[PDB]
Amino acid sequence: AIRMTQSPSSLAASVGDRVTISCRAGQSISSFLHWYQQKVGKAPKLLIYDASSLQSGVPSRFSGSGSGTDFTLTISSLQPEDFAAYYCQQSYENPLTFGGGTKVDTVAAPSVFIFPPSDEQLKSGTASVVCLLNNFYPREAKVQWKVDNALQSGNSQESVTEQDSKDSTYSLSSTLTLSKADYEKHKVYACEVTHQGLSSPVTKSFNRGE
Amino acid sequence: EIVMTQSPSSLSASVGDRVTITCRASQGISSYLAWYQQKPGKAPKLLIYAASTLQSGVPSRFSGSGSGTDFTLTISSLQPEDFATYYCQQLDSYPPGYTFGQGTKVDIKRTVAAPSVFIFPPSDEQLKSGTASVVCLLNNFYPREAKVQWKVDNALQSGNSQESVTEQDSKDSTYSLSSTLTLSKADYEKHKVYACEVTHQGLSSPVTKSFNRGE
Amino acid sequence: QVQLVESGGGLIQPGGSLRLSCAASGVTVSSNYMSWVRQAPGKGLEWVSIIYSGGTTYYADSVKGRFTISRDSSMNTLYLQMNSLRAEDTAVYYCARDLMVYGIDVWGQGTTVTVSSSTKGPSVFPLAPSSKGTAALGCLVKDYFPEPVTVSWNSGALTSGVHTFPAVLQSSGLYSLSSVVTVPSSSLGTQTYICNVNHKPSNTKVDKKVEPKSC
Amino acid sequence: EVQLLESGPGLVKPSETLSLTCTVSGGSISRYSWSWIRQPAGRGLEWIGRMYSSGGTNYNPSLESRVTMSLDTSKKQFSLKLSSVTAADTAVYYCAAASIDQVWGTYRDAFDIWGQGTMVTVSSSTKGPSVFPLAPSSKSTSGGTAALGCLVKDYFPEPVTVSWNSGALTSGVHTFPAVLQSSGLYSLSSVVTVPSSSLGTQTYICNVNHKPSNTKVDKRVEPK
Amino acid sequence: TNLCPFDEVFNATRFASVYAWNRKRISNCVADYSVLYNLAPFFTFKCYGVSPTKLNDLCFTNVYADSFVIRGDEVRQIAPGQTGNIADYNYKLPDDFTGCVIAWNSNKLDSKVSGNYNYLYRLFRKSNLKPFERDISTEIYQAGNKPCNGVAGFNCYFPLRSYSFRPTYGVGHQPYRVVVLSFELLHAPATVCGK
Predict the structure, then answer these.
(1) Homologous superfamily in CATH for domain D130-221
(2) Which residues of E are less than 8 Å from A93 in CB distance?
(3) Residues D118 and D139: beta-carbon distance below 8 Å
């Protein structure tokens, strides 16, 4: 199989920046290279075919170049809708192969919200506490849980959305799950947030039982 | 011209057997091949086209495979309505022709049955006309393959005999064959011992039935 | 109604001419690959000619310069003009719709062509049972033209154990055939056996009594 | 416009045969090449094979011994069979088609049409979620903006889909990636930020679909 | 002093299908006849109506370069006065064709192990093609009495098929790249001269 190698595997850039992604084939593939854009939770979309030809409706800020072994995707002025994973594909020989992908990721501080467990969930025997960070950039954030001021470690899981196609921000949720009996042993449930957009770490809490 | 060699010429199978028929092309024809089914008195029926694609309406137990020179038709589970004769075709433009295979007859298989051999001298009424027809009968045998050798005073006769085979009997699945040795009256009166030697799978050794002219 | 209907076949002397017709309904002849396929008695299918929807025609080597394929779009009919016919052209002729790689899906019922150089009723000779549990006797229906003949035994009263073989074509151009039956040996002296030979083309009906030969 | 819809088992046992089918609408089947592509979690796209309306097939050699592709032009469908499935066959499976090149060529190796993909999980029973409200309150109301949501808990396998107000509410919706809990069941949250004045005025209903278990729930989320 | 773009036609990395054959209009240039001047024996070279040794001494109004791909058994049809599926339904040359045809075995370029179904051809057409006619229509061919209405069914088939070029096939089923050079001389200024 013709091995395709992309560089970098991930890069962070601002709106208006020039982005360049290299793709190298293990052998000459002439011009049989295609570029795909994949948004979070979406199928891939064809961007460029035959190393340099733009697909219909693709903006002219995208450009492809290269031949033989070495290829490049350039975004001349990055837009909020361009934050995506990018893949090169060769179509010179079977099997068809993809590159490893390149993830393209102003500062905005998160808005922080906290949700106690619902009464419905408590009735069933468990307590999930949810912390929401809304509309922030860059993606890096630290979210810690404190329960009556005890730092939780290993007790929560988080996940992060897609770079919004309008404002290029992220949102994140973190969930702390306890048994109902353990939930009822404590009073103050807090999530602490550290982010570049914040002067200092911030905390939002509630007291069990309002 | 392309020569389509199809084998075997005939094969015997019971209901539920997995049947395989082979077609070999003289030169490469890629996937340009088709398989047909034909029953006595009917038109051919297209089974497979493009070597391995099943024609619409054909049961799924039929399947074709192969590309280039060697091709095989496969009946995974033979059914009663599948006892027929099958052909392969080079459905390719060059070189003209569109040649068919020699064909493969798929008859009903049963236990081996040896034939009953009878020899019939020419009638006195026919000898009065000037021609002598000696007939050898092979009654109710299986399988179809049978070899009949005429001997005239121990001289093996070839070229002056014709054969005829009945279709597989609808009740005991046996075949019956007739062989007619034709001579002039003058030639018939030049020899004494007339015999037909029958070799068959059901016979441990060749069976010979004979008569002497005028006894 | 998707069908092909052949006509125009029949008997003709060698060197003569004959025109076959193929009336189509459902399939448009001028829009398809239309082929003629023939099948001699007891042999396989032989491709004859094809006409492309664009007018391109092709012929087998054995029929080049003698056969010419044509069509009439207004009639939706395929034709095959056969000139300088020979004996080996004797076959059932099928017209068919060729789909190239998709096979030949539509076949006609076939029209019979017989090329031979005169109408004759058959001579019926007895195949007498020998003097030596079950015995075989029969009738030799020899030298007739054309096909076919029908044979019964005891006006249809005897059917069990009857084998009427398919006819063979002799070098003389006349057909020969034999119909045998196996009976218990105890009945040869008490049961009369007559074979009934019917040959409509010659207005010939013959009843031949088969008896054990008297030395 | 040609559309592609994947169908098949969302959950399969080890050593079974996965059978996927892609249904084709809105065009001629004979003008496209038809491909299967998979995307394992944390990996790139992997091409499985291609088929033509002529019956010609090409496979990825690494999968060729386990893969069979078939085309049913009468049903307008093409299918993938994958024998002897393993945990490594857990992926999103996409059907894709190649553009009907005119001057360019014929089957310009460039997948212009994609299906939405289907999640196939290989593990030895499917389980539907419970849906709990994340109710808006003073603790999820910072000034003029309030947050509310649904917690979609204890289901297996992925995926779930969530919409709000039958698709009429899209602004401010954030549906997060599911997390695999230590129980081996997934949990996911979907939240929306809304004007605080709309609490008790706009009805907020999250529409949850867990296709593997055929579980659909419309949960109304009310304050307090 | 522009040179006629012959390298772009012969040295092209990808060729067109026979049903959608590509044509390069070459005019107002100096023809370096050398790609066809000395061709090796493994090249099929047949000229009609004009001699190759005289092409350097002739000026033409326009020279058309038609390129496509067929299989080996079909190259004999790319000629004046020929019939067949390629000649009648894909690429037809006139009876008074003035030019040369060039064809070479491209089994090392257009044949994949798993089959190269990219190259296509037309199988069904209601009538024959006129000389230099290109039909890229993909309408469902009606072979029966009932209208198709874009439905692939009985007596309603798609008019294009794939070649499936595999290297293990015979020479008659291996891909051949064809380049047809037409030499036109009408009432016009002659601009394609030789040197």
Answers:
(1) Immunoglobulins (2.60.40.10)
(2) 112
(3) no
